[model samples]
Target: AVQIGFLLFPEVQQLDLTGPHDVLASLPDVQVHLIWKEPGPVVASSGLVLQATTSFADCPPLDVICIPGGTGVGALMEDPQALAFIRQQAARARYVTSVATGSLVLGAAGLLQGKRATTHWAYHELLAPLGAIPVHERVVRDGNLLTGGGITAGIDFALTLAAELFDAATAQRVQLQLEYAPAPPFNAGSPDTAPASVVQQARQRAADSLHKRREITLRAAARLAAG
Candidate 1:
C-alpha cells in the first residue's frame, strides 16, 4: 500500500486538499494521512476546520506528499518551522505534489528548482525566479513533481497523477465514480474566456492580498535558503 501524506497549515484552502484527497483515497489499499503541526483541527481559508490524523512531528514514511494552497500560503511563507517541515518531507517523498498557489510554498522549499510547474494563472510568472519553468497547463508534471493550477485544477491534477502512478483504467474508473464530466454553465472558467472587464475587476479585488502574499512568501524563501 502506498502511504500518502498531506501537510496542512492554518487557513489552507479546503478544496486544494479535499479535491486531491477524494481522488487519491479512492485508490485500493492506499493509506492517507492528514498531517499538521499538531494532531488536531486545522482551520481552512473559508473558516472550515478539518481534523488532522497525524502531527508532522510523528508522521511515518510516505510515498507521496501533497501541499494545498490558499491565503494560507502567505502565512506559511513567513513560517520557518512550516517550511522546514515541508522541505524535510519532500526530501524523502517518492512523489510530491501541490495545488494552486501551493506551488509557491513548494518553490519556497526549493523543490521546484529546475522543474516545470504551474499554479493559479495570477502567479504563474512568479515561479521563474524559483528556478522553475512555469507552464499554464491545468496540471504540470515533471518527473516526480506534480503541480496544479487553481482550485478546480486539483481534481484534474489527481486524475493525471493517478494515471501516471497507476494506469489509465484506474484513473478513468476513479473519474467515473466521481462523475468527472463537467459542463460549466458559464464559459468564464479561464481568463481567456472571461471578458477583459471581469478579469480586471477580479484582479483589482485580489491585488492587495496578492501583494502582501508576495512579500510574505519572499521572506519565507529567504529564510528557507538561509537555514
Candidate 2:
C-alpha cells in the first residue's frame, strides 16, 4: 500500500486537496494523511479551516506527497518550516505532485529546478524564474514530479496519478465513482479560450489578492526563518 500525504496550510486551495483526496482515498491498500507543519486546524484561502491529523515532525515517511495550490502556495514559497519539510520529504519521495500554483511552492523549494511543470494559467510565465519550463496542459508528468493546471485540474491530476499508480481499470473505476464526465458550464476555463474581458477580470482579481498576500507571506516567512 502506498502512503500518501497531503500538505495542508493556511490559505490552501480547498479543492486541490479535496479533489485528490477523494480520488486517492478510494484506492484500496492505500493510506492518506492530511498533514500540516504542526498539529491544528489549517485555514483555506476561502477562510475555511480544517483539522490536520499529523505534523511534519510526527508523520510517517511518505511515498506520495501532494501539494495543492491556491493563495497558500504564494505564502508557503517563503515559509522556512514548510519549505524545509517539503525539501526533505521530496528528496526521498517516490512521487511528488502538486496542483495549480502549488507548483510555485515546489519551485521555491528548488524541486522544480530544470523540470517541466505546469500551473494555473494565471502564473504560467512565473515558472521562468524558478528554472522550469511551464506547459499549459491540464496535467504534466515529468519524472517523479506531477503537476496540474488549475482548480478543476486536480480532478485530472488525481485520475492520472491513479492510472499511474495502479492501472487503467483502477483509474476508470475512480473516474466512474467521481462522475467526472460532465463538462464545465462555461467556456472560460482557459485563458486562450476565455473572453478577453473575463481574462482581464481574473488577472485583476489575482493581482489584487496576490499583492496583499505577498506582504503577509513575506512577514510570515521571516518569522519562521527567525525561529
TM-score, per-candidate, Cα-based: 0.93, 0.90
**Shift in Å, residue 115, candidate 1:** 1.8
Candidate 2: where are CA atoms >4 Å away? 210-227
Estimate, for each residue in 29-96, the C-alpha lDDT of model 1 and write its tens digit.
78999988888898898999899999878888888899898888877765668778888888888888
Give the alpha carbon lDDT tens digit for every residue of 131-206 in model 2.
6888878888899899987786766777777888899899999888778786779988889899999999999988
Residue-pair clash count for candidate 1: 0
The Cα RMSD of model 1 versus the native structure comes to 1.7
186 Cα displacement, candidate 1 (Å): 1.3
Q: Which residue pairs overlap in candidate 1's backbone?
A: none
